[PDB]
Each structure stands twice: as structure tokens, then as C-alpha cells.
């Protein structure tokens, strides 16, 4: 659309979740040429939505897929492919090179940010309208990292959070505000979260909100609210005792708002939440211990009340199937009064758990908010690790 976007609506009433799109990438990859991806996200253009993910430069079935469990290699790009098609060697478009990304569209065209390099000489290049325009070196030389999901723009301004430093320590997270590709401004992490890792975001009423990972000492979730106009921000935790990170302790009756709810150490998983008062929904794995299942629970006022519980659920995928990363996205350009809220779930396959195959790849599964209360299905990746042997 020839004019930048504004976030002018609020969320629609989230009463159940319908299916939006699921590629069956791993089921199709026992016989077409699908690339091994990991870390998916889905982000829309004014004209189409498309799945994204980091590639590993090899197909599921080809010999170089052995060891795609390694997060970082100079063979990974951010690639897009049409909704619910597989990332296949032939329909996949490359966006930019490197091992951590984040991309979003500003109303006019799209930005895409790729981070690359060795852990202590890594570098970000912010592409905008498929041309490189800015580069950022590491500020702390320890695996410089950005969102792994859709970033969000308002009036030409798209906040990105980055983190460089350790996911065990204090690390140095830093919020940037780009416009048309250039560094407008940036800010150090302000507010109460201990460590910020890997956020997923959304926008409503001129506010960009983000749910993230406390990989340091938190089983609850640091949340960052950004004012795109003031180019300013806070961090805090989700008050609700329903813990969404994973691994997890049992859920308290009273969680904690301003510090990491403790129990688990140096471990997390990327995840999201829609924080909108009575109409709040928190996604989390069904497993306490590992990436199995995905549940969506209505927990009214979860961000604020430190004693909040579910009033309604929805299982996205059974505990006896596998889950993984999750982040949010919205069709910002979509006719209506409000924003249909949506999310994706990475279905991870292979190693380390299904170790009989030497690879690790995944599937997208994805849902969006239905105001009617629709019946539920649960949505398995679907492949049999035994046909690849």
C-alpha cells in the first residue's frame, strides 16, 4: 500500500481459534525436495501472508542434513515460501544470509534483518526493499541475536529487539527503532526483566507489545511494551501463575510480576501471548519438561493480576505429539473493525529426541482468532520417523 501503516484497531474478541495454515513440510519431505528449516515465523505483506524460517542449506533427504541440529552455520538463510506450501528448493525465496532474523513490512515495503558471523564477530544487516541499507556490529561479542518472528511497524517505525551477551548471564539487550532501514534511535533494556531473549510481538492501538524468553533465571515471561511514537519502552513479567516458558516448575497459586518466577535454570523456548485484559490468551507447551503439545488458555488479566487462572482452553496439539517455538503474527492489512490475532507453532522433528534420523527439521501449524466458539482439533506434524530409515 503506497503509505506506511498505523496500528489503529485493537484486537478482536478471541473466543476460540480456527486453522489458518499448516504446511505438511516434513510429511512432504520424505519425497519432494524440501529444505531442512528451523525457527519459522509467518509475516504478512499488504498483498499476501507467507511462512518464513531459517534454512540449513540441504534437503530433508539429502546427505548434508545430517547434523542440522547445529543452530549456527554459514549455510542458513531467511527464506519465504507461499502459505502452506513446503519450503522447497524451488519455491523458496531468499531474503538475507545468517542465523537469526526478524522481518516485517512497513506499509510501504518490507524490512528484513539477518545476523551472521562467528559468535564473537557476528554482524546484523538490515535489508529494506530487498537491498541492504544498514549494518550493526556486535556490542558485546557473544552471539548477537534478534526476534525469530515478525517485527511490527507504526508510521514508518519498526522496533526490533536484539540481545548480545550470554543466555546464562546478564546479557546486553538493546531495542532499535528503524525507519526506512536507517537507525532512528535505540535504547538499552529498561524495566524489570533480568534477561531478554528472542521476542515475539504484535500491535494494537499504537502500541507494539512483545512476550519473550527469560533464558537466564525465569520460568515466567518478560514482556516489553513499546511506544513506536515516543520511541520508548518498558519491561515487566506476566503476573499469572500459569507459567508459559518450558521447562517449567508446577504452577504456583501466586506468581511474580516483577522478578523471574524461579524453579528452572538456563533454559527456555520462544513463545507468545496476547495481553489484552479480560481478553487475554497465553500459549504454552502441555509438557512441563519438554516441547510436547501446545495449549491456548484464556487467563483473564494475566499480565497484571498475580493470582490469575485459566477460564477456558484450546489444545493446538496433543502432549503425545511434539511442539517447539511459537510466536505471533497478525494480518495488519485485513479488512474489518479489529485485528484477527494469530500465532504459529514450530513442530520439531528429528533429533535430539527422535534420534534415529540424523537430522532435525520441523512444520508450521498456525491458527487465528475466531469470535464464534468453534470446536477444536489437534494438529500433528504427522511424519513417521520410520520411513526415513
Amino acid at each position, epitope marked *: 500500500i503506497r503509505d506506511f501503516n498505523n496500528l489503529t484497531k485493537g484486537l478482536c474478541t478471541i473466543n476460540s481459534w480456527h486453522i489458518y495454515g499448516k504446511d505438511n513440510a516434513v510429511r512432504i519431505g520424505e519425497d519432494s525436495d524440501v529444505l531442512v528449516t528451523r525457527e519459522p515465523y509467518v509475516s504478512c505483506d499488504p498483498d499476501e501472508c507467507r511462512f518464513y524460517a531459517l534454512s540449513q542449506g540441504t534437503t530433508i533427504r539429502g546427505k548434508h542434513s545430517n547434523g542440522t541440529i547445529h543452530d549456527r552455520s554459514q549455510y542458513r538463510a531467511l527464506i519465504s515460501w507461499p502459505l502452506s506450501s513446503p519450503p522447497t528448493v524451488y519455491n523458496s525465496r531468499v531474503e538475507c544470509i545468517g542465523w537469526s532474523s526478524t522481518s516485517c513490512h512497513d506499509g510501504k515495503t518490507r524490512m528484513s534483518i539477518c545476523i551472521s558471523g562467528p559468535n564473537n564477530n557476528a554482524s546484523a544487516v538490515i535489508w529494506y526493499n530487498r537491498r541492504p541499507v544498514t549494518e550493526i556490529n556486535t556490542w558485546a561479542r557473544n552471539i548477537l541475536r534478534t526476534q525469530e518472528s515478525e517485527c511490527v511497524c507504526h508510521n514508518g517505525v519498526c522496533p526490533v529487539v536484539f540481545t548480545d551477551g550470554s543466555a546464562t548471564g546478564p546479557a546486553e539487550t538493546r531495542i532499535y527503532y528503524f525507519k526506512e532501514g536507517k537507525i532512528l534511535k535505540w535504547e538499552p533494556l529498561a524495566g524489570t526483566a533480568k534477561h531478554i531473549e528472542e521476542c515475539s510481538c504484535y500491535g494494537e492501538r499504537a502500541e507494539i507489545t512483545c512476550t519473550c524468553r527469560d533464558n537466564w533465571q525465569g520460568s515466567n515471561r518478560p514482556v516489553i511494551r513499546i511506544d513506536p511514537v515516543a520511541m520508548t519502552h518498558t519491561s515487566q513479567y506476566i503476573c499469572s501463575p500459569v507459567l508459559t516458558d518450558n521447562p517449567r516448575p508446577n504452577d504456583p497459586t501466586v506468581g511474580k510480576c516483577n522478578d523471574p518466577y524461579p524453579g528452572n535454570n538456563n533454559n527456555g523456548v520462544k513463545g507468545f501471548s496476547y495481553l489484552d485484559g479480560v481478553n487475554t490468551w497465553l500459549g504454552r507447551t502441555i509438557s512441563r519438561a519438554s516441547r510436547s503439545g501446545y495449549e491456548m488458555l484464556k487467563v483473564p488479566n494475566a499480565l497484571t493480576d498475580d493470582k490469575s487462572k485459566p477460564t477456558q482452553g484450546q489444545t493446538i496439539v*496433543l502432549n*503425545t505429539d511434539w511442539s517447539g517455538y511459537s510466536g505471533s503474527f497478525m494480518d495488519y492489512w485485513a479488512e474489518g473493525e479489529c485485528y484477527r490475532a494469530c500465532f504459529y507453532v514450530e513442530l520439531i522433528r528429528g533429533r535430539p529426541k527422535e534420534d534415529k534420523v540424523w537430522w532435525t527439521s520441523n512444520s508450521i501449524v498456525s491458527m487465528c482468532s475466531s469470535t464464534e466458539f468453534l470446536g477444536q482439533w489437534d494438529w500433528p506434524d504427522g511424519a513417521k520417523i520410520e520411513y526415513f530409515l
Partner: nanobody
Amino acid sequence: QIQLVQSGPELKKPGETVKISCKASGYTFTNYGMNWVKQAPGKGLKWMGWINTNTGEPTYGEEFKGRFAFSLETSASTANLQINNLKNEDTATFFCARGEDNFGSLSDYWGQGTTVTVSS
């Protein structure tokens, strides 16, 4: 909480087959798979495999493939072990634990056991 009970302890002479049961109180059977652990008076705890109480997919640890069969009576929220062509080597106490996760890496909750004595 979850309260799995197991059948009484049998005596079966070499060659036979025994039905060993786990009946699930506490949770919703289908979203948590059954784990089966053997405890000889020897090694200590051994994993025999899992059962996906959703589809019925069974997984067996190598030493267990073939003479053993995890099965379920879904309806009863029951899981069963079956040792066929019984060896006096199988003389031991078996457990059904409940797999916290997909495949049953952690086993939150264990039944009380069922002791088989293979003997003439």
C-alpha cells in the same frame, strides 16, 4: 492426584503368558502416554518402552522387542503388558509409570508394581 493401580502378583511357569494391568485414575488417559519399567532384584530400573495412549503407538527398548506387548483397554483407561513364552529370566517386578511428555522421558507417577514369579 493420578492414582495408577496395577494387577496382583502372578506365578506362571515357563512358557506361559501373563496379563499385567495398569488402571489409570487421576488424569485424562489420552493426553499422557504409559511407560513400563522393569525392576529385577539386580540392575535396578529398566525402561521397556512407552505407549502412546492416543493412537496406540508402542515403542520398545531393544531387550523387549518381540516377547512383550504393551496394549490398552482405552475405555477402561487401562494399559496392559503381556509377556508371552515366559522365561524364568523374566522373574521380576514391573511398573507402569506415566510419561509426563511425548515418549516418556520423565515419569511423574508410578503404579504399585506387579510381581511375576516364573516357576515350576
